[PDB]
Design a protein around this ligand. Structure first.
Ligand SMILES: CN1CCN(c2ccccc2N)CC1
Length: 123
């Protein structure tokens, strides 16, 4: 019945980006323990957790291109046939697949989605 077990996209620690993870504990006072998909764990405030699973079509996101540089793109599709989520991300009229954990949100991109998808609460 609780928020535990939900897949989320959440601000990591006090960094500039939100990353994919899972809520593993309600630690009280509107904070949650998260297990991030890369294996790291931290406590995150509810205001900094997005509940959209998956991130929806036409969302502006960030991803690594060519194993070289991070830049923005737009979500244009999803694949979950294998039981693992992949996103189709469009950059400059061209699309490429990205595993769930490779799609991240800058503070601007993630804060944008609070009104629609934030855990919260928000006053
Ligand atoms: C979710 N996951 C947590 C660890 N992060 C990290 C790794 C190595 C250096 C800095 C940072 N922030 C990457 C994102």
């Amino acid at each position: 019945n609780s928020f535990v077990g939900l897949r989320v996209v959440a601000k990591w620690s006090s960094n500039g980006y939100f990353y994919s993870g899972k809520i593993t504990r309600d630690v009280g006072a509107g904070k949650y323990k998260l297990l991030f998909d890369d294996g790291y764990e931290c406590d995150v405030l509810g205001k900094d957790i997005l509940l959209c699973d998956p991130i929806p079509l036409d969302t502006e996101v960030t991803a690594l291109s060519e194993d070289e540089y991070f830049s923005a793109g737009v979500v244009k599709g999803h694949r979950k046939e294998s039981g693992e989520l992949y996103y189709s991300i469009e950059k400059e009229g061209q699309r490429k697949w990205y595993k769930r954990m490779a799609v991240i949100l800058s503070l601007e991109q993630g804060n944008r989605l609070r009104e629609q998808y934030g855990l919260g609460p928000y006053e």
